[PDB]
Amino acid sequence: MAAEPVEDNCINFVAMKFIDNTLYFIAEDDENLESDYFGKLESKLSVIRNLNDQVLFIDQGNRPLFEDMTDSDCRDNAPRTIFIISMYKDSQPRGMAVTISVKCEKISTLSCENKIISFKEMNPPDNIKDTKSDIIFFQRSVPGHDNKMQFESSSYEGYFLACEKERDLFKLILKKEDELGDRSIMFTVQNED
Numbered sequence: 600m601a602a603e604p605v606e607d608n609c610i611n612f613v614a615m616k617f618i619d620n621t622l623y624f625i626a627e628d629d630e631n632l633e634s635d636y637f638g639k640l641e642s643k644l645s646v647i648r649n650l651n652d653q654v655l656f657i658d659q660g661n662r663p664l665f666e667d668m669t670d671s672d673c674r675d676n677a678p679r680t681i682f683i684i685s686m687y688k689d690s691q692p693r694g695m696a697v698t699i700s701v702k703c704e705k706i707s708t709l710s711c712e713n714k715i716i717s718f719k720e721m722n723p724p725d726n727i728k729d730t731k732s733d734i735i736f737f738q739r740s741v742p743g744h745d746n747k748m749q750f751e752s753s754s755y756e757g758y759f760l761a762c763e764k765e766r767d768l769f770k771l772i773l774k775k776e777d778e779l780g781d782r783s784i785m786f787t788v789q790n791e792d
Contacts, residue, residue, distance in 0.1 A: 602631035610636065610645035610784065615653055615680035616768065617703045620718045622680070624762060624769040633767060642780040645762050645769070646747050646787040647682060654788060655702065657685045662723055665706045677704035684788060686738070690727040695738040698723045699750060699760070709771075710734045711752035716771050727753065747787040760786040
């Protein structure tokens with residue numbers, strides 16, 4: 600809740616919101632840090648934790664089953680927001696290609712079309728070969744952190760997912776690796792073993 604006056608240069612997310620097809624993040628200690636951490640934006644990190652079952656990882660063959668991962672009850676409220684990381688086995692024979700999606704009332708897929716972060720009511724592609732790169736991501740590590748994971752668009756190499764603070768919530772934006780820090784912080788995800 601309360602935040603410490605430290606230069607750990609990392610914000611932790613513990614909750615999310617999906618509003619008008621826009622993805623928001625809630626910090627663990629979003630009472631103090633909002634006006635403390637952001638005096639010296641030296642390309643600082645943020646990471647989301649799966650401590651509330653809010654991050655979903657796909658191994659392979661569950662990728663196309665997103666439709667069946669939704670709820671049918673409490674339709675007036677819809678299910679909580681879950682952030683999805685997909686993986687391919689066929690794409691990137693010498694790496695790892697991914698797509699980013701969110702689960703809610705519907706299944707939403709993240710696009711970086713025109714370097715703009717937007718969500719579309721569509722299922723994820725089967726591969727990166729016959730698919731528009733605008734909706735394809737590549738999986739990268741963070742240079743200095745193992746647990747932290749970051750994503751960049753296929754269309755625009757060097758452009759990574761980032762978070763931006765509007766008033767209290769954080770929203771998902773696209774920023775160049777060199778741009779990160781210009782009123783922005785890096786969005787990362789905590790992996791699992």
